[PDB]
């Protein structure tokens, strides 16, 4: 053609971005964004943790350089974050079957994982993940070359975790096939297995003979607890079924720009360990030299210092308490306007997003009448509530469900 | 199989890595390290350039946040990236018919660019690059689905750019083929063609109308002007070929482990452009969701701000003086040593990486003898080049090619 790219079309405009948009020109004075996709203090204000300062002016004082680092990444990062994620004692450490790597962040994990199962894992090419899953999923193990399937994981009836539904359909799973499971809070729902469902789920995994591949980007901001978050991916592994782990910082740290994320895999043996090191730096090498240095610095100097990890933990655990805070908040205006509908879900669900149920009728409704800016699907993000407009929002949505 | 990955194999070692090893178990003290990757100042001491410092102490005092940046990058990151690249008066700024997204690096451009001819680039599925081209551009575009091919570019015969050859590979490639031209130094050997033969392969590339992929990470850095080393990019430009450039800033400005990068194509009008803006994106958000924000957010407080651009020229022409000043004492101290063999390609050769024709016998005959650690074919660091040592170098290659 005469154009190199004159065949090239428009790309479908993000329905994030174009909430965030519809809310800006908004002239109300009374308008809310609960689309955001982070963290937010309650004043509404993006939140900087004091840890992260701290961390931050020593790096500062160290005067350190900023030559290329490992292929793999910080050595005393992913010693961290694997020690972090598996737990100071656990037996892994100990017999060192394991293997982590740098990355850029949750996604890069994400897409690492997905690129080193396109390349070696043999077994199957396709991919299982919730139905209601987060929507970058998708594009990334279609771009790495796996097909995709879905398993039933919410039950739009009950605003709750489809127990029965999600065993037949993980039963029915074939064999040797690639597991996704959201470690913690569901990034679209918000809504964990218990950990007896938890429990039998890993039993079901075990008995077929799955490959789990575990997402966990909210461990420690989900409920304030590392440990009960990473509850789960721990009692995968002490039943004996190697698992792989995408860890974010961005949120359980506020490190939102600095990319900073690491990509964990259990082995049976050390050797096996270091093979799968090296065919993850193979991999990685093309995609990008290096990962970042100054996230994944600071995300070491606060995981290894004592204080600055007791800090970050308490502030972490004050998040998670003003995330459940403005949920109860909610629950109990909405039982003060005097509104029937059992908003039990509410509380139950854990993490930043919530389904409240509502339909896209009642979705418009809110955008127009109460210029409440949402998705379609009806997911609100929780760190967008304040408890000054938590009793706006609380009156809209009775009004809107009367 | 019992184990998941019973079948993956130890990677094969990397030879950078490995020499680095060789050099650091070594006991001499008189040892040499020429295979390193990045600037060393005269003591041999990593560099920080000031005005990197100038600008962190900027941000701190700024006390800026941390949430995520554009898909497609810092808005003022590009902007200031495409001018440079472009020249501040280009006519493509002018009429906006381009467009520029932050990358992880030139890694992350080249792959990027690499996945959009994937995706888009119908016409063809053959990437020509040199014959000694840098080590990461096959399997960047061998994982990213296009398959590559070789051209003529350096004569072992003279050790300088094989001109004929060149042409004559460039004129036998096919019609409509991506073209991948090293911008500036030759990452490899640091040859490059002069501007009448810039000319020829600029008129060869638009009567066969091929397209061009730019590599330009050493700007600046190569001779201390940046206009001359990007006189290539911008010759082709207003000869009407469109370009596609991924520069990094990890020399030009010492940014090594920040993974600063952009990568820019030239379009022909500025809806092209914003259409492959989102086709970029719609790329980009699979691999990563955004690219870091410390390194971007230094790169364009050094570039907007007039007194911190003028500091990084002059610390950049300094470097690439330090550099043009090693090449003529090693030239010089080989001249006294009474060495008859024409070394003036070494002086010829522009870049970090220089190639002084050395035969691998003669390259084991330095590592066991001399204790000077060196890759194979014979490429050398210049920024490993000490003043002090300079002179041992040069006594031992003509000890070697005596
Ligand atoms: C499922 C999931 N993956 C990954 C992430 C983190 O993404 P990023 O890599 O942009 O930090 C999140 C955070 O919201 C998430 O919910
Ligand atoms: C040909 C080439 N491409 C790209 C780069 C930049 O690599 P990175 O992305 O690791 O900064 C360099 C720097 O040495 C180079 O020589």
Redesign the pocket.
């Known amino acids: 053609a005469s154009s190199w790219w004159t065949h090239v079309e428009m790309g479908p405009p993000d329905p994030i971005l174009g909430v965030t948009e519809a809310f800006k020109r908004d002239t109300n004075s009374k308008k809310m964004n609960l689309g955001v ?1 982070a963290y937010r203090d309650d004043n509404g204000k993006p939140y900087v943790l004091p840890s992260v300062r701290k961390a931050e002016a020593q790096i500062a004082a160290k005067n350190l350089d900023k030559e290329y680092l490992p292929i793999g990444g910080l050595a005393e990062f992913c010693k961290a974050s694997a020690e972090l994620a598996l737990g100071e004692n656990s037996e892994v450490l100990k017999s060192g079957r394991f293997v982590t790597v740098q990355t ?5 994990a ?1 897409r690492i994982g997905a690129s080193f199962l396109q390349r070696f894992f043999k077994f199957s090419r396709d991919v299982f993940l919730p139905k209601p899953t ?1 929507g ?2 998708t594009p990334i193990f279609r771009d790495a070359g796996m097909q995709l399937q879905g398993y039933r994981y919410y039950d739009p009836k009950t605003c709750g975790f489809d127990f029965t539904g999600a065993v037949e359909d993980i039963s029915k799973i074939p064999e040797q096939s690639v597991l996704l499971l ?1 470690a913690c ?1 569901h ?1 679209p729902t918000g809504v964990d297995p218990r950990p007896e469902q938890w429990k039998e789920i890993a039993t079901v995994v075990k008995k077929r003979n799955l490959f789990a591949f575990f ?1 966990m ?2 461990q420690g901001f989900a409920s304030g607890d590392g440990d009960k978050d990473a509850w789960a991916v721990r009692h995968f592994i002490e039943q004996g079924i190697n698992v792989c782990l ?1 860890q ?1 910082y ?2 359980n740290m506020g490190l ?1 720009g600095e ?1 900073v ?1 690491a990509f964990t895999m259990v082995c049976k043996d050390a050797d096996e360990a270091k093979r799968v090191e090296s065919q993850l730096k193979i991999l990685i090498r093309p995609m990008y030299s290096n990962p970042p240095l100054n996230g994944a610095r600071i995300a070491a100097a606060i995981l290894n210092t004592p204080d600055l990890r007791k800090q970050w933990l308490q502030e972490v655990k004050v998040m998670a308490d003003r995330i459940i805070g403005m949920r109860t908040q909610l629950v109990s205006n909405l039982k003060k306007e005097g509104s029937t509908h059992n908003w039990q879900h509410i509380t139950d669900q854990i993490g ?1 997003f919530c389904f409240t149920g509502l339909k896209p009728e009642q979705v418009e409704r809110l955008i127009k009448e109460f210029s409440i800016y949402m998705t379609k699907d009806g997911r609100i993000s929780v760190a967008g509530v304040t408890s000054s407009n938590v009793g706006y929002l609380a009156h809209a949505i009775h009004q809107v469900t009367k």
């Open positions: 996709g850029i962040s949750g996604t890069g994400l987060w970058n999923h959201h809070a990034n997402d980007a909210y995408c974010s961005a949120k939102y990319r994320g930043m």
